[PDB]
Amino acid sequence: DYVLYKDATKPVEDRVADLLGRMTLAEKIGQMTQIERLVATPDVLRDNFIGSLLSGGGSVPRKGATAKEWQDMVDGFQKACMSTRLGIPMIYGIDAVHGQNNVYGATIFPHNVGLGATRDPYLVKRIGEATALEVRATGIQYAFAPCIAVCRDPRWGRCYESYSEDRRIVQSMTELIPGLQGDVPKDFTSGMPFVAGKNKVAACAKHFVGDGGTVDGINENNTIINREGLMNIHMPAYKNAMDKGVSTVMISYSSWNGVKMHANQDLVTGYLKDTLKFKGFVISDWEGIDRITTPAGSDYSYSVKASILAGLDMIMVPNKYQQFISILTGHVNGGVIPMSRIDDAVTRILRVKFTMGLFENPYADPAMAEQLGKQEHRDLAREAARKSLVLLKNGKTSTDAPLLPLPKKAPKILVAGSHADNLGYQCGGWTIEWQGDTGRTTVGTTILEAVKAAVDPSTVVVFAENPDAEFVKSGGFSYAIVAVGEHPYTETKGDNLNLTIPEPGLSTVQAVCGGVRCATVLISGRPVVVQPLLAASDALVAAWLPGSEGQGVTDALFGDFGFTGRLPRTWFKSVDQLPMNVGDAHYDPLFRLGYGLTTNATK
């Protein structure tokens, strides 16, 4: 007879209700399971009724795989899922945190800390629209972004994934959501999940909650603060996400006053679902429930019981799916976990799938392949990189002539430094590989290539990665551009207590600037000990992690556009002042939040 749930013309809540009622326990638990592509097989997806798949950082079909190879891989998996009794399509997720970053040839936008320096929410909304098209170009429909953490201590390895230490800026940057998912209707009800169509993707606000406020910036550790402080610093952005229809929310590994977020029913069910009225589904982090205990994974049975009762809806296992499914089934059969909780989770997961049109368009669009790395997107990234640059110093003394903007025509100039010709360093973490990489890992323009593309044909450009002092003095250069900074890092490997750039870095700046007027470009994911660098150079620019379009840096260096960026974080004098944020009593910074010198166009 007539099957309601398959009727595309019926309202979403009806299709969900009709489908839920036909499902067996095995099929329901299947929808709550997300596994890595590395352990997926057509048989596994079919026999276990899997509901979702993902690619962790660096998990790709092949190195250098084209957009069509990605589409074929995703469709292959979807084929299996659609061949099940009920034909429920799977949803594929990936970390597209600054462009479709796991993919070769995808446009790489500046990381969030830099985007905060632009104070331009409209720009970020456009990046969201471009990112969605590039994710859809590879057949993927779900992005694990944006991270709306409020980094309160730069020693944290993920501070660069945070827009600012000021929650007001983070709130305005939630405009990324409507860019990724599409604008919500006028009749929209805060808390409902929303996705416009096949050229948009479901978004994910992470990590709930207080992930950027851990002690000493230790990744995944404990956030010690009172409820009121939690509610006015770390929670605000989540309410904004609700008003914009964010489809899902990911739970943090961190704990609040000793309680693991992955087991906190007060905040997950009590606040997020019952108070904020969130109607999308809640997903865990990678092996998030395993780390509820210590050691991790030492009592998986308890992990499943605690997280599911706490209120999670989908579990990013992501490898040992047999144990997860077996243990969860046991708890239900034993009455330890009520069927209503299961039904609630599956209802939320299906609501999102039906709303985004998954049942009507389960496969990839071969025509979208041309969207990967298109010039219009690169021009946008270029504009973003340029607006994210913060000019900290322009002339050694107040009576010195301004070094920037530099003239495009000069007899001979010098480009030096470890970061002057290294695309990987320029992109930082979450680029191609999980931790990022060194060298030419994808398609883009380095700072050296940008300079050569900008100067007058009569200008002689000489490159030297680490020149000694007399090479510089006898070279007869008009000026030099030196680029140095941090190396790529992600998550815990990013936790740093000293916050000083690696060598050679300071020595290169000293050797070069000692011989000729120099403009120093600092590449980093956060503020670092800068005094020495500041003392040696005539001009210093904070470029953060600009991404693949290096011409964004030179557009401002040679005067095509003026500097407009402003500090999104507080720049400390020394690490023992930390934590130190705008508002504190001991607030004595080297540069205050909002600081930034400017210039006007034309060299």
Ligand SMILES: *[C@@H]1O[C@H](CO)[C@@H](O[C@@H]2O[C@H](CO)[C@@H](O[C@@H]3O[C@H](CO[C@H]4O[C@H](CO)[C@@H](O)[C@H](O)[C@@H]4O[C@@H]4O[C@H](CO)[C@@H](O)[C@H](O)[C@H]4NC(C)=O)[C@@H](O)[C@H](O)[C@@H]3O)[C@H](O)[C@H]2NC(C)=O)[C@H](O[C@@H]2O[C@@H](C)[C@@H](O)[C@@H](O)[C@@H]2O)[C@H]1NC(C)=O
């Ligand atoms: C301030 O704190 C930080 C963090 O704690 C500390 O840096 C970390 O130091 C670790 C040492 O315990 C180091 O672990 C070793 O890493 C070796 C390989 O490291 C290279 O490859 C990784 C990627 O796998 C990069 O992240 C590293 O930056 C490094 O990269 C190479 O570095 C060299 C030297 O600068 C450079 O010439 C190469 O071009 C570059 N190539 C690449 C791949 O980019 C392993 O072999 C070894 O087994 C350890 O695991 C951490 O990697 C490092 N963390 C990062 C991300 O930097 C820092 O320590 C200072 O810097 C390091 C590099 C070293 O010179 C120390 O002697 C020095 O003290 C510390 N600084 C201060 C002020 O103490």
Ligand SMILES: OC[C@H]1O[C@@H](S[C@H]2[C@H](O)[C@@H](O)[C@H](O)O[C@@H]2CO)[C@H](O)[C@@H](O)[C@@H]1O
């Ligand atoms: O990628 C999904 C999810 O990941 C966790 S970190 C995760 C890496 O993806 C994986 O490549 C490596 O082997 O393990 C780590 C375990 O910590 C991240 O917190 C989250 O933001 C992301 O969406």
Ligand SMILES: *[C@@H]1O[C@H](CO)[C@@H](O)[C@H](O)[C@H]1NC(C)=O
């Ligand atoms: C926090 O990090 C410290 C560092 O060793 C560790 O001993 C402690 O168990 C961690 N606690 C939390 C909240 O994860």
